[PDB]
Amino acid sequence: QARKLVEQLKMEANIDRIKVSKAAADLMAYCEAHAKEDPLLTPVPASENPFR
Template sequence: MSNKEAIANVQRQLKQLRQEAATPRIPLSKACSDLMQFCQEHQKSDILVTGINPSENPYKETKGCVVL
């Protein structure tokens, strides 16, 4: 790696670190309470919680063809 490439690499890393340092921070307790509130508000419309209505399930197993 040439000297110019090394300098460019360090400059990119420095730019990334400055962007990360400028990111606003919130306390973990606030983030957790916000996440819990969001989950509770959207729980009724979450398919993973409520399940899929069997009549609307596109992946349900169909009856196979029986040949006698």
Template sequence: MDVMSSSLQQQRVVVEQLRREAAIDRQTISESCAKMMKYITEHEQEDYLLTGFTSQKVNPFREKSSCTVL
């Protein structure tokens, strides 16, 4: 009997998860792509991969200069 109630409880958990997933608002791929392209176009000036850095000091990925004493 214990195994049966455990299985029943697991099935209830699965059903609840499926209900939550079914309630999620869905969008078509074309809508999602259009929104993504709009976002990218609006923010492309802030994208350092496209525009580059204004100076090397601003670049967090620049090679660190090492201090050497001769």
């Protein structure tokens, strides 16, 4: 059963990686770009709010 595990680990080894700075920058840019249209983040107006 060790052959399957080592083959899977070898398959996982050969994948491209991007620096954590780039990934964090992308996440921050997305959170900034979509921040405006978030009902939870910005309290929605009572008229616009469906539940209440």
